[PDB]
Symmetry: D3
Subunit: 297 residues, 6 copies
């Protein structure tokens, strides 16, 4: 609604987030998806049936293909959201996540710098991150955490493009990991709104964070086993018990703005507070009662 | 004292840690240093005056040179300790730390796998890490955190070599960052002992951690301003107020063994405790009195 | 049934062909799948629920990851079947098919040569090709055609491994391209049998071809519109009207062996016949009657 | 005669075709040759003795050298004609032809895209192909066939440069391969005229084909053994009995224009005819009588 | 004094020469240092305490980092002075000097050509060479000798930037190599003056040489052993007995201009003299008396 | 005559030297030529008509192709002789000579080290150098000079293979450069004998030099203008007036052995003489009379 008449290029836009972004913006914008699997390209074209949706086959690891594609499109907005789904299998296939996440993003970022003179339209770059990047404890989270610093780094040296990140928890859109596990609650539409908000209202170099309630995963799964038994699988390798969105180091540079928090870039000398805090899914937890009402609505 | 008659190869062994390792082991072992600055090689050769010390000029980033050097030496033990000194300047020179830390280590690790048949002597690989790798908040710490997972990963697939990490805080061997800042106290000899302990007593895939007291950095600097004024500079970019050596996720797989703690590899299904804890420099802090007595001894 | 107690490694084994090969051989063999999408790995593991199935995340384009994986597994048999599904989109994304097909195969083939001494188990390499590689007219077919020559080339220089190809048409397991279009008829199980036959009964350097009936695609689609209207879309870019399995040049070196034909390697001086022929889907075409009976059974 | 006052850059212009192009255009144009062997550069300079001929030493495989050279010259016209002479030795040295043909052309093509802003003069790019690229049966032909699709691909995305191909048979300017072998007859001057015609009259994305008579190679060799015995060597590896210039798939998009045929680009939806045909050296064959009269003139 | 209001970028400017250049020009110019060791960056910043000094962490071997840095700075002047100190250890670590010297310089030079349109400010490039590059006899000298030809080469093709070299002997700012060894005498300030002179008064493609007296190294060391015994170590590997600044081939194209000699570029047809000469430290040697007076002043 | 029953692999063996080596050794040895131009391969095969001669198409720049070829052949002897003919055109195409000479040789040398375990037969490696590598003054000579040090370097670290160089002047097998120009006189057969002598009688790490008379080039050309006028062209770019085979630095480590001189490796501490000398074509020059008698015989 504040993104209109734009060409939006999305790396990894053939998944859930990508398809929701397309549904949301295709009526008023050109959308270019860049991803590897052309089967999904085919099905997407059949769904939207619009010349305003273009797919490019390519791997974000491939600098040449990334550079050629960005220069062909000359987009106003770039959104980076390419990554694997099952985060835990990064742990013993580490090269695979380093390359897709770190190298992929450094490919896109590099084009915006070295080929800046050929990208007259580019105004904003939005990297989609994850709560797993905050105080990370697994390879996937560590790589995403590095990705954020790379975005912050470009924002320091390249002043005429807005570089922002968003960081969020699990999107909702019988098995139980652990009875103590907590997560933040958010929907696929919340993700999209977060992304637009950051593009429009975030400042270059910021990491923007949504204000979310949280739940015991056990409370949720219990509900589903009544509308519709439960096996308790163990923790996966590298998995933590809770989600953290802001840690005490970041909290000192976090400006709260109602529904969203803006983590100021590290190169900003401003100290917001010395009353440090953590923002995690272990606090402000919905009752089972409250969770039931939310899932219902 | 349990490392004798070995050929020990150290990447980045021309600094403080490298020189202490040389002083400690040169009487009974062959030592090969691999690092970039040949001025330090020259001075080191003049100091030790021993044919048992060999220097190779090379960058750990350079896979070809790393591979050729390891295959020439065929060491019993490899220690990786290459990194920059001023950790904060990684933050806007990120490629520089990704390459030296992540790519450098993946070069060494790769040789041990792909060239295993040419390395008949290799028994142990020890990666030297840092408390900044625990719940990391800056690019340097994030990269080191990834390095640990890479070492753990090789330990899963390569069963006939011991791959271990050690993780420690600041080594002690007028300006003040912040009056609230805490650090763990350890000496250069403690570092070395930690490294030997891990090589001898660590198991493949473990990250081994020293039991250390901690101090208010302010308490220390105050002492020095009496034996011998103090400026309070601000926090540097990416710097945290305290050091953390074990976080609550790792604590669930940590086996305490007296003076050292062994973090079991992520692929080990064993749950040691569900009473999670954090091990950080904000707890068990020495009084100024106690710190004075320690610095004295 | 003649493949037992083997470790079989399949590049691109998470699709239709891969899953059928797994169903067929998992009871008596170790199966390793190498492919990019770990979502399919997850679902496959849930289906077969066997420790005899292992997935590796990796791109066949990635020489390092391919080499490391083959050396870890040390398989008896390698099957290469990685490619995209919608063949026509290669035509304006050519780099994408050159890399996955030509470069991917030259990665696997190279490991078998340069790392031969570390692959003590390897006995057979089977490249899965396509009728589109015969007198090719589109980029996908041209790239596959080159792949075959690469397999034939290794077979000339590496005498102690069997390198074979199979080439086949469309696998069966409302829209109409063109009323004149013909295809060969074969099922997913026919594909598998072809692959086993080539591994067991093919000679190194041969390209083995199945004897198949063919159909008017119009005849087929007409049937489905009665059991269950039809739109006639045009030809796609690069698409031919028929499938060809042997052309007149290959026919001179083709040894027929009942249900299969063996195209002798180009370096074999043997001239089988000078009565050249073409083997294509435009000849020996089933009546609608005959096609109905076949689809029924 | 319609190419005047141009700077023409030729990759592989030190051979027969290159030297004829130089003789034809040097009086009125700047000619830059790019090729590997400086002995031929030396001799050529001695022959033409003109400052209007410049040689650059370089391999078309070498992207850096190709890019630097094109940007230095800033030509109006680029002609690509680099390849080996003895086509059959590609068959067991496949990497060599993939690199020179496919990679070489993708180097030149890439410069025209990524460095477009530095190439203000470039108007036309002409790729020189071969009848062996039509329904190809050997590695050389397959690689050239792919080259054509690459040229067609650039023509789709880059609208302000004309990208064209020409495809032709053997140029005429005692041993017999096979008594049944046929070839198209054309001279070195015909080649040049074809190239100019395509540059001037071809449209971007077309492959332009000459109307040629054909001959039994036996008829020709018999003549030479009278003006001036004959050994019948066998077919070489990968060699076909005849030359094909248009196949039945291409025939449906071929516009005949008198002395030349224009194969429309695959992305053009236009269907010229559904009365498909093949254009090959097995049809319209000169009598020995007719061939003698032609060779005479 | 003729370099004012410029941005000067120095590769390898954290050593002796770099620090002197900074002291000399920082009052009136922006100085950017590019080098690997950030410890020296830190100390330098503490010394000069000026925002007019900027350090970039990077290796000259790293084309990407070199290109990104030059394009960020857009300097008026580039000075290349990166190399190792102990020249003799190049001899059995040859790759290390080829990469830092030859590849490093070809990285910088390439940016000035391929990225010329993004470097609107660049006016001069000064390569710092050494007498060891004249009739070289060791790997270090040979590599520097090649570096000079690379600078001369760019000067031929790139007409709107001044590319110059300077070549000099040992800078002065108990052990004896050999009693016969001679060297040219020059100070650190002489080096700087030479560099400025070449930038201002050298022509593109020239190598500019200082007029210097020379000394027996034995004469010097004898003096120091009186103000303040002497060990005679042998020659090092690859070391010559004397320094040569101009050889007889270069002498034929050398224009003397008082305090400096200008070696004309090889592509200049001008023959200055056929009375060839050598300019070396074996001639015009100071007496011990004369050397004492010079060292005193 | 002391090389029998060997497999000899020659890089760049399709030229004059290569063909003479083949004529000399083919009766009693297997010869493998590795070079780029397959036209020369074809003609050579027609000349020798022997299965004992094998050609591989490849560029010495191409590490992969070099490594694959050496491992396929597993030769007893490797001779490196690949370079361009017109030495002066290196001067403004420097990358071309750096790559073919330095990078080409480091490709071959590297295979002998990293793939040593797969090269059970390799006994000797002979690099063919040139007098232009002695006190070099042009890019070609500088690159060859570096090549020699690379060969000497491998000889230091790899003790079970003999690495040797030979260095020689012009081979004899109307225009005048300059009336003062001198050259050493040697024939193509002298070259071959030198090569065999070095392989058999040279020690690892030595550079072996032939004892040769020299001539005024003017004296020679005058003779040819009587048996059969003369133009005096100028010096070419980078050309020196004379050839030097030993310089005063090398002379101190040169052991004379009658018809050949052996330059001891730089890492050999042995000082042969301190009575340094130069060995060049400006001394011991034949009279016109003497030259006439020599050319006659
Ligand atoms: N609950 C959630 O789903 C959460 C999601 N996020 C973030 O959202 C983003 C996307 O999530 P979601 O839409 O659910 O993800 P999906 O798994 O549904 O798809 C992600 C996309 O990335 C693409 N991709 C993966 N690897 C590559 C590659 N190497 N090159 C090019 N494209 C690639 C995939 O396409 P293809 O396979 O065809 O190449 C796919 O289009 C991620 O950044 C993630 O960190 C964060 C927190 C929670
Ligand atoms: N208080 C402390 O000092 C602490 C240290 N550590 C760990 O200890 C280890 C070493 O510390 P310390 O000895 O103090 O470090 P130093 O700064 O004194 O030296 C580190 C070494 O790394 C080398 N090096 C840096 N970059 C490269 C490169 N690209 N290629 C090859 N070598 C390189 C340097 O040699 P050169 O420059 O010549 O190449 C030097 O020899 C590090 O891993 C660090 O994480 C952890 C916590 C605290
Ligand atoms: N009858 C015929 O001759 C026919 C020719 N053609 C086409 O004509 C074109 C040229 O034919 P023709 O002139 O006879 O060929 P030539 O064999 O006479 O020479 C071809 C040129 O390519 C150059 N070349 C080869 N490899 C490379 C490389 N890797 N890098 C740079 N240059 C290279 C050669 O120069 P150098 O070796 O010095 O590098 C030479 O100048 C080819 O594209 C061919 O397909 C098509 C049909 C028939
Ligand atoms: N007597 C003398 O000192 C003479 C000097 N010269 C010339 O002067 C120049 C510099 O001399 P001087 O100042 O004494 O040298 P120093 O040894 O004092 O330092 C040289 C500089 O080069 C840098 N450097 C080395 N390798 C690299 C690399 N791979 N990437 C980036 N930077 C690198 C070093 O920084 P860092 O290590 O931090 O990367 C350092 O800043 C050289 O070109 C030399 O040839 C010539 C004749 C005599
Ligand atoms: N008077 C003389 O001729 C002298 C010769 N020498 C030395 O003798 C050696 C050879 O001389 P000569 O036989 O006359 O040389 P030629 O010019 O006759 O041929 C040299 C060989 O090198 C090959 N070659 C060149 N570049 C490459 C490359 N990039 N990859 C693979 N092969 C390549 C050529 O084959 P192709 O082009 O097909 O690739 C050719 O076979 C050289 O090392 C030279 O330094 C030294 C002094 C004098």
């Amino acid at each position: 609604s504040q993104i209109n008449d734009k060409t939006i290029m999305i790396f990894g836009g053939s998944g859930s987030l990508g398809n929701r972004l397309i549904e949301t913006y295709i009526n008023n914008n050109i959308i270019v998806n860049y991803s590897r699997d052309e089967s999904k390209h085919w099905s997407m074209e059949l769904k939207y049936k619009s010349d305003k949706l273009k797919n490019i086959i390519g791997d974000i690891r491939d600098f040449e293909k990334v550079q050629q594609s960005i220069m062909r499109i000359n987009p106003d907005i770039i959104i980076i959201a390419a990554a694997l789904k099952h985060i835990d299998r990064c742990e013993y296939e580490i090269n695979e996540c380093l390359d897709t996440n770190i190298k992929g993003l450094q490919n896109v970022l590099k084009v915006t710098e070295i080929n800046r003179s050929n990208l007259s339209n580019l105004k904003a770059v939005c990297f989609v991150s994850t709560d797993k990047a905050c105080s990370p404890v697994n390879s996937y989270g560590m790589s995403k955490a590095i990705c954020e610093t790379l975005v912050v780094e470009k924002s320091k040296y390249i002043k005429d493009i807005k570089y922002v990140c968003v960081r969020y928890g699990n999107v909702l859109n019988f098995t139980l990991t652990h009875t103590s596990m907590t997560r933040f609650i958010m929907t696929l539409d919340d993700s999209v709104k977060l992304i637009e908000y950051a593009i429009i209202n975030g400042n270059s170099g910021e990491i923007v964070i949504p204000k979310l309630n949280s739940m015991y995963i056990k409370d949720m799964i219990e509900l589903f086993a009544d509308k519709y038994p439960i096996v308790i699988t163990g923790l996966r390798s590298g998995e933590r018990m809770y989600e953290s969105l802001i840690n005490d180091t970041q909290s000192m540079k976090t400006v709260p703005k109602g529904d969203y928090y803006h983590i100021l870039p590290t190169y900003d000398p401003t100290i917001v507070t010395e009353e440090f805090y953590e923002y995690s899914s272990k606090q402000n937890i919905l009752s089972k009662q409250e969770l039931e009402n939310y899932l219902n609505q």
